[PDB]
Design a protein around this ligand. Structure first.
Ligand SMILES: NC(=O)c1ccc[n+]([C@@H]2O[C@H](COP(=O)([O-])OP(=O)(O)OC[C@H]3O[C@@H](n4cnc5c(N)ncnc54)[C@H](OP(=O)(O)O)[C@@H]3O)[C@@H](O)[C@H]2O)c1
Ligand SMILES: O=C(O)COc1cc(F)ccc1C(=O)NCc1cccc([N+](=O)[O-])c1
Length: 316
C-alpha cells in the first residue's frame, strides 16, 4: 500500500506515525530515535503532552546524523486549549517549534474545539470543578491558525476532536482562506466513527485515527474495561494473517484511507507496529472489525461537558 496520502494543501502525509502522549520524557527520545531508524517518518506531538523538548532532541539528532532529511519528516503538533486567543496562537506555535528544534511544522492542529481561560494551568477550573471557558470562538482561532501558514511557521493546519457541525462551521467560515487539511479523532473497532469519517472524507479532509489500540495506558483505565489487544475475535483475525493483534489494529484504519498514530515506547513494539505494509485485510475482515463498534469512547474530560463547544453531545 502507498505510504503517504495527499492532503488538500498539496503535501503528502505518511499514513503511519508514532504517537507520543504518555511517552515518559526519559524514554521518548530513544523511542523517536528507534522509530526513525526503523522507518517512521511522521511523529504526532502536542504541547500539552509535556515532552516536546525530548521528542525534539531525537528529531534533531537524526537530522544531524543524516539518517533522514527534514523534507522527509512529517511533524505534527497541536495548539492547546488555553491558547485559543488571537494574541497567543503564534507564541504557542513558536514554543512548540523551539522545543521540537524545528523551523516549521508539517501540520498544526487545533487540539480541541474548546477554548479555556489562558494562564499557567492547562485546565483552569472554577471552585466546583468546571473548566473555565474562553469566549474566543472556533472561527477566530481558525483565522489565527491561517496566519501561521502565511508566516511560514506551519505547512498545513487542521483540527482535532471536532464534530461534524464544528467541521462544517469552519468550512462555512466567511472569508475562509485555508481549509482544514486533517481532522484527528479517536477511532478503533469499538468506536468506528463511520458517520464523521464519511463526512470529513466527502469534504476532502483527511482523518487521522488516534488511540487505535484503545489507549490501554490512558490514566483512567479500569481493569474491567474492554481490551482491543485481548479481544479473541481480533486475535483470530491476526492469527489467520500471521500478524500480531496490534498489526491488525494498525492496518485496519490504513485500509479505510485513514492516517494512524499508534503510541509505543517499547523498541520492539515500535518496530513491529511499522511492519504493516506487507499484508491485506479482506473486505470481510474489514466489515467484521467494523461490526465490533460499541460507541466506546476513551478520550474525553468530565470537566468540559458543559463547555459550549464540547464536541461529544452531538451524535457525530
Ligand atoms: N488529538 C487528540 O486529542 C489525541 C488524543 C489521544 C491520542 N492522541 C495521539 O494518538 C496517539 C496514540 O493514542 P494513545 O497513546 O491514546 O494510545 P494507543 O496508541 O491506542 O495505545 C498505546 C498503548 O498501546 C501499547 N502498545 C503499543 N504497541 C503495542 C503492541 N504492539 N503490543 C502491545 N501493546 C502495544 C503501548 O505500550 P508501550 O508504549 O508500553 O509499548 C501503550 O500502552 C497518542 O500517543 C497521541 O499522539 C491524540
Ligand atoms: O487530549 C489528548 O491529546 C489526550 O488527552 C490528554 C492529554 C494530556 F496531556 C492532557 C489531558 C488530556 C485530556 O484530558 N484530553 C481530553 C480533553 C481535553 C480537552 C477538552 C476535552 N473535551 O472533552 O472538551 C477533552
Amino acid at each position: 500500500m502507498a505510504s503517504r496520502i495527499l492532503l488538500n494543501n498539496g503535501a503528502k502525509m505518511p499514513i503511519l506515525g508514532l504517537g507520543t502522549w504518555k511517552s515518559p520524557p526519559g524514554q521518548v527520545t530513544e523511542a523517536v530515535k528507534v522509530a526513525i531508524d526503523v522507518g517512521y517518518r511522521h511523529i504526532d506531538c502536542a504541547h500539552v503532552y509535556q515532552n516536546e523538548n525530548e521528542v525534539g532532541v531525537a528529531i534533531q539528532e537524526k537530522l544531524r546524523e543524516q539518517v533522514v532529511k527534514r523534507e522527509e519528516l512529517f511533524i505534527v503538533s497541536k495548539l492547546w486549549c488555553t491558547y485559543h486567543e488571537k494574541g497567543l496562537v503564534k507564541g504557542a506555535c513558536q514554543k512548540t517549534l523551539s522545543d521540537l528544534k524545528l523551523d516549521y511544522l508539517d501540520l498544526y492542529l487545533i487540539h480541541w474545539p474548546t477554548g479555556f481561560k489562558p494562564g499557567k494551568e492547562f485546565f483552569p477550573l472554577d471552585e466546583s470543578g468546571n473548566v473555565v471557558p474562553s469566549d474566543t470562538n472556533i472561527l477566530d482561532t481558525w483565522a489565527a491558525m491561517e496566519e501561521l501558514v502565511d508566516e511560514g511557521l506551519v505547512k498545513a493546519i487542521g483540527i482535532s476532536n471536532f464534530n461534524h457541525l464544528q467541521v462544517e462551521m469552519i468550512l462555512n467560515k466567511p472569508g475562509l482562506k485555508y481549509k482544514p487539511a486533517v481532522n484527528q479523532i479517536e477511532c478503533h473497532p469499538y468506536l468506528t466513527q463511520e458517520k464523521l469519517i464519511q463526512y470529513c472524507q466527502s469534504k476532502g479532509i483527511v482523518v487521522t485515527a488516534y488511540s487505535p489500540l484503545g489507549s490501554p495506558d490512558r490514566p483512567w483505565a479500569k481493569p474491567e474495561d474492554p481490551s482491543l489487544l485481548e479481544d479473541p475475535r481480533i486475535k483470530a483475525i491476526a492469527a489467520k494473517h500471521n500478524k500480531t493483534t496490534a498489526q491488525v489494529l494498525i492496518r485496519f484504519p490504513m485500509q479505510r484511507n485513514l492516517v494512524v498514530i499508534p503510541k509505543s515506547v517499547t523498541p520492539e513494539r515500535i518496530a513491529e507496529n511499522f511492519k504493516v505494509f506487507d499484508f491485506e485485510l479482506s473486505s470481510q475482515d474489514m466489515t467484521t472489525l467494523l461490526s465490533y463498534n460499541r460507541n466506546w469512547r476513551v478520550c474525553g474530560a468530565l470537566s468540559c461537558t458543559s463547555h459550549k463547544d464540547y464536541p461529544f453531545h452531538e451524535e457525530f
